[PDB]
Amino acid sequence: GWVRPDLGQLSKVTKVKTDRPLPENPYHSRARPEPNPVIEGDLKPAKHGTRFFFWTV
Amino acid sequence: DGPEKNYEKTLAILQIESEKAELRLKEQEVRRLMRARGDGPWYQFPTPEKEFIDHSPKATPDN
Question: Using the chain's own numbering, where are the disulfide bonds (chain B)?
Fold first, then answer.
């Protein structure tokens, strides 16, 4: 009772059911380093101007 | 206007200049620490972009 597959049938992506668990870390990755502690807060003006030598503002 | 005007103006000027000096020294220390061990906003040298990496399945399974 075998039927030859048509054109385009063997070449398509098929789902498959398995009881094998999904590997959570396939790359055996180490722990990612934490990012820099980003600074939050309101943007206050510069204290006493630019503070470039003798310039007041 | 009298001597108290000049006296208190000099006090305000000295406070401003002392605060500016302390801020400049602190800025030098901050820049030195960040350049030595970059962990603040400044001196963040670049890194190749993460979003341009293929994660789709490929021809060779050992990837």
Answer: none
Structural contact between residues B34 and A36, judged by C-beta atoms closer than 8 angstroms: no
| B24 to A2, A15, B3, B21: CA distances (angstroms) | 85, 65, 32, 5
Which residues of A fall within a CB distance of 8 Å from B43? none
Kindly determine whether residue B20 and residue A48, on different chains, have CB atoms separated by under 8 Å. yes
Q: How many helices (H) and strands (E) does chain B have?
A: 1, 0
* Residue B19 contacts residue A47 (beta carbons within 8 Å): yes
- Residue B20 and residue A39: Cβ atoms within 8 Å? no
Contact B22, B15 (CB under 8 A): no
Chain A residues inside the 8 Å CB shell of B41: 36, 38-39
